[PDB]
Amino acid sequence: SASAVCIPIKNAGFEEPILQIEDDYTIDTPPGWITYDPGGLVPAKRTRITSNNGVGYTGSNSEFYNHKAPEGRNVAFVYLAQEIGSGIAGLEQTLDAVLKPNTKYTLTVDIGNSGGSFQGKTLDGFPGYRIELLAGDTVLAADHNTLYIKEKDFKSTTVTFTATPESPYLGQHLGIRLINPLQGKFSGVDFDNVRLTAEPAET
Amino acid sequence: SASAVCIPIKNAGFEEPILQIEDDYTIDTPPGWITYDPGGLVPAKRTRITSNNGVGYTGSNSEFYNHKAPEGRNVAFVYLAQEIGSGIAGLEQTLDAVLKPNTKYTLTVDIGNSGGSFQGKTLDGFPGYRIELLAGDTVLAADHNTLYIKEKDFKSTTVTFTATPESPYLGQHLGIRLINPLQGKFSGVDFDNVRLTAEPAET
Ligand SMILES: [Ca+2]
Ligand SMILES: [Ca+2]
Ligand SMILES: [Ca+2]
Ligand SMILES: [Ca+2]
């Protein structure tokens, strides 16, 4: 951890684009990230009532969380309007760094369970979450909904992965997926503070 | 964890059938479990060199592990002969228990990275592992290859899951999957000591 190094990630805290009004949010894919929608659940033209993703201002007076964003003023969100078990969707980003042998990777991200209500619709419930670390288009490691996150709360999850010399994915581009697996309603989940460190692998 | 109860699992330590010779093994789906092969990588007629699974005696004089099986004398194993990325396969078991609200489930299983060599073929390498907790046919929680297990070693992994009263899977039968995701060679991974506890969810 003392010799840990950070792997560069674009818009890691979803601080772009800048917002100012409490509870304000966009419905466009946050800059630096791309929408992960293998089942085409996110419409070409998005509206506030369709499946969508974006950044949301989360200050100390947020209606959805007891505290402000874990990092900065913004958190990213992924909302799916389809029925439970209809599929999965989220944010994804390919990194410049490649997988190196004898290296332990530590991927940490804060998961938010929005609570309260919006326009008469309750935010009670949670669709779960899944964090993935990739090499190429292969999922090296993932944590699927193991954390318990209370409503209006944010919780840190950690995904580790050690690349050995026998790995077949050495030299492939690293990647990160923030997924909403749609396993419950209200089907919205927030993320923030994406961090990816690398260090010498365990002896 | 003091008021935690265990959920019944058949042949949880793969202690049946009984074996007596060091490193001896079977190639039949361990009793109490069923083979998980959605892509059909396991041929109907199994042989010692085809993709297979079964139980293997792992004592204190094993040629493939530094220590004895984490529990009892046997361990389960899942071998895939196919090339890396051809698919996943493993062991699955539906439990009599059903998902209950306000309950935190703890699924623990020891994962083995067999090492050494046999007939000039190295055991070096690991195909990774995935532990899943289910309700019906839905994966509620899972740990995908986040643990670093040295060769000839066993390491325990934990998958937690909290069911809220808002869960849409309440009353569905619990399930467990031990998966070989074929993300490396030697593509053999062992499992042992499957435990599933239940306790009142945190407040
Ligand atoms: Ca932020
Ligand atoms: Ca919620
Ligand atoms: Ca055993
Ligand atoms: Ca090995």
Tell me the nearest-neighbour CA distance from A16 into chain B, angstroms: 30
Length of chain A: 203
B187 annotated among ligand-binding-site residues: no
Ligand 3 centroid distance, CA of B110 (Å) = 10
Contact check, Cβ <8 Å, A142/B144: yes
CA distance B112 to B153: 6
- Give residue B92's domain range: 1-203
Q: Which ligand is nearest to the CA of A164?
A: 4
Ligand 3 centroid distance, CA of A144 (Å) = 26
Kindly state the DSSP code that residue B202 receives in the 8-state scheme: P
Percentages (nearest 5) of helix, strand, coil residues in chain B: 0, 45, 55
Half-sphere exposure of residue B143, counting CA atoms within 13 Å on the CB side?
26
A147 annotated among ligand-binding-site residues: no
Report DSSP letters for A33-102, one per residue.
-EEE-TT--S-SS--TTSSEEEEEE--TT-SS-SS--SSSSEEEEEE--SPTTS--EEEEEEEEEE--SS
Residue A51's nearest CA partner among A22, A88, A78, A18 is A78
Whose tokens are 């929680």? That residue is B141
Contact check, Cβ <8 Å, B146/A143: yes
Which residues of chain A make contact with B140, given a CB cutoff of 8 A? 145, 183
Contact check, Cβ <8 Å, B143/A143: yes
Tell me the nearest-neighbour CA distance from B106 into chain A, angstroms: 10
Ligand 3 centroid distance, CA of A62 (Å) = 51
Tell me, in Å, the resolution of the deposited structure.
2.3
Question: Under DSSP, is residue A89 helix (H, G, I), strand (E, B) or coil?
Answer: strand
Residue B159's nearest CA partner among B138, B137, B140 is B140
Q: Is the torsion defined by CA of A137, A133, A173, B189 positive or negative?
A: negative
Q: Which ligand is nearest to the CA of A19?
A: 1
Token couple for A45: 């033209």
Pairing outcome for strands A74-79 and A117-118: unpaired
Cis peptide before B126 (omega within 30 of 0): no
Instruction: Find out whether A141 and A180 touch, Cβ atoms under 8 Å.
Output: no
Question: Under DSSP, is residue B173 helix (H, G, I), strand (E, B) or coil?
Answer: strand
Tell me the Cα Rg of chain A.
17
| Chain center to CA of A12 | 10
Residue A64's nearest CA partner among A128, A150, A151 is A151
Number of folded domains in chain B?
1
Contact check, Cβ <8 Å, B142/A138: no
CA distance A197 to B149: 20
Ligand 3 centroid distance, CA of B142 (Å) = 22
Return the number of other C-beta atoms located less than 10 Å from residue B154's C-beta. Answer: 24
Question: Angle at Cα B82 formed by Cα B79 and Cα B84, nearest 5°?
Answer: 95
Contact check, Cβ <8 Å, B141/A145: yes
Map B86-121 to HEC letters: CCCEEEEEEEEEECCCCEEEEEEEEEEECCCEECCE
Residues 6+ apart with CB under 8 A from B203: none
